[PDB]
Each structure stands twice: as structure tokens, then as C-alpha cells.
Amino acid sequence: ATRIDYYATVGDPLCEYSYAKSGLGFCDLDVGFGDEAPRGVLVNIHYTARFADGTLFDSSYKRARPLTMRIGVGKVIRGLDQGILGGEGVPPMRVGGKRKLQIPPKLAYGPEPAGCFSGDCNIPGNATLLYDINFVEIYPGSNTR
């Protein structure tokens, strides 16, 4: 619920969510140009993650570095893997690409308050998160393992 870790950003372009069959609200903004997002490698992304009403709780620009995630092998949320690679034929991301995502709680952290360090929690139950992924690059040296 609370602990937004207040980081006033500017916002991102709004666009309608061409939903997926797995419940994922999927929304491409800027199609990348380069190699596809490979299933199993470290990929550097930038993102702004927002709750339902739009409040920001996490962003890679807050820590001023791309986020290095291993996509596909479940190190991340299922919404992230299904909105970066695409399971049900959803188009994957390319390098230098941007993409909006409305992560549903079925794919997001369930009805479980993911992250509860003292009294209050980073994520509330049934959050229906909102990600704004900016795929910046693949990790320059990466393995499919």
C-alpha cells in the first residue's frame, strides 16, 4: 500500500492496452530496432512501475541505472516475461524499444502483499500494476543459461 519511495517523474505516453489472452494488458509504444529479446539472457531495461491509480512505487531511473534481468527463466514476474517475450504469440521487444504493460494480479504478485518489511508493505494485495518498459539493450556479454 504505502512506502511509495517518492520519486516525482514526468510521466510516459498513454496508449490503449491491446489485451492478451493470459489477462495481460499489453501496449506497445515504440517498436525497437535490432535483435529480438532472447529467452534466457540478461537484458538491460529501464522502467517506471505504477499502481492502479497511477502512483509510482519503483523506477530504474530512480537508481539511475538500467535494470539487468534474466528474462524467460522466471527470475522476474510472469507479467514481465509475458510482456517482454510474449508467450501466447505476443510480439517480443527489440533493443531500443519501449512498451507499456498493465500487469494483472493473476500475473503480478497475486493477492499477496509482496514485500512487507515493517508493518506496511511495498505492494498491496491485488495491485494490477502498470509498467512502462524501456528496453535499452541486451547485456553486452550474456548466456542463454
Binding site: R39, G40, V73, G74, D81, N143, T144
Partner: protein, 153 residues
């Protein structure tokens, strides 16, 4: 059934065969699971889910049920699931789904000629596996074992 044995389970319903003097052993939660005493992942196993259905052609199409059975209910995210061909038969009055997939982790090259069925408020998911390093030699044997699952009342 040349070197085979019709292991029947009259309290559960499923009946099928084994290639060649495969032992019996307890799986984590399957019933029979019958490994083969030298190879590790060369085993045939089967279980249930207490469904509320009677036919497998109503819960969904074969080409659409194998997808969410393999990619979402068998294969873990760490492994990629190269789903091979899926085939259909009719035994007595029941459809018969039998398919093939390969769960390739970065290590641990393996595959499985699993089949799936339903009946009597149960959902039979007979899986038979082996290693991908030695699979082409042991393809038809586990094939003719996998299609040999029978349901009876």
C-alpha cells in the same frame, strides 16, 4: 505386448505396459512410476486430477490443451518446451490425446512422450520420459508404451 506386462489398477482405472523388466518405485505423488533400474529419467508415470468431466474433447481442443498442459502445467520457466507432434485416437468411446515434448534446460537434456486422458471424475496424465542424449534409439518403445494406456469401467 511382447516383453510387456498389462499392469491394471482396478481401484483407479488406468492400465498400461512397461518395456522390459522395469522396476516399481514410489514417485513423489504419482502412483506407479516404474523406473528402469539403470537409466534415471527413463520412466513411465501416471496420476490423476479429480476433475468433474467425462470427455477430453470438451475441456478444450487437443492443439490448445497440449499448449497449456506443456508450457504452463509441465515445463518450468527455466526449461524451454519444444512441443513435438500431437496425435488423437478413439479407443472404445473416448478420445485419446498423445503427444511429445522436449524440456530443454541449459543442462539436463530430456524429453517425454506423455499422453493424457479423463474419466470417472479423474484426469489421467500418463507421462513417460527419457534423456535426449539417448532418445532416438528408445523412441518407438516408449511410443508404443505411451499409446497403450487404457481406461475401463
Amino acid at each position: 505386448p511382447k516383453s510387456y506386462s498389462p499392469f491394471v489398477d482396478r481401484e483407479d482405472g488406468y492400465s498400461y505396459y512397461y518395456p522390459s523388466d522395469w522396476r516399481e518405485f514410489d514417485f513423489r505423488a504419482h502412483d506407479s512410476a516404474f523406473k528402469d533400474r539403470y537409466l534415471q529419467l527413463q520412466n513411465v508415470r501416471v496420476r490423476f486430477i479429480p476433475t468433474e468431466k467425462n470427455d477430453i474433447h470438451e475441456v478444450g481442443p487437443m492443439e490448445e490443451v497440449v499448449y497449456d498442459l506443456v508450457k504452463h502445467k509441465f515445463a518450468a520457466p527455466n526449461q524451454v518446451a519444444t512441443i513435438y507432434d500431437m496425435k488423437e485416437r478413439v479407443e472404445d468411446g473416448k478420445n485419446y490425446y498423445t503427444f511429445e515434448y522436449g524440456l530443454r534446460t541449459p543442462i539436463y537434456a530430456t524429453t517425454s512422450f506423455a499422453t493424457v486422458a479423463v474419466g470417472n471424475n479423474r484426469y489421467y496424465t500418463l507421462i513417460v520420459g527419457a534423456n535426449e542424449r539417448r532418445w532416438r534409439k528408445v523412441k518407438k518403445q516408449l511410443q508404443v508404451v505411451a499409446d497403450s494406456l487404457k481406461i475401463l469401467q
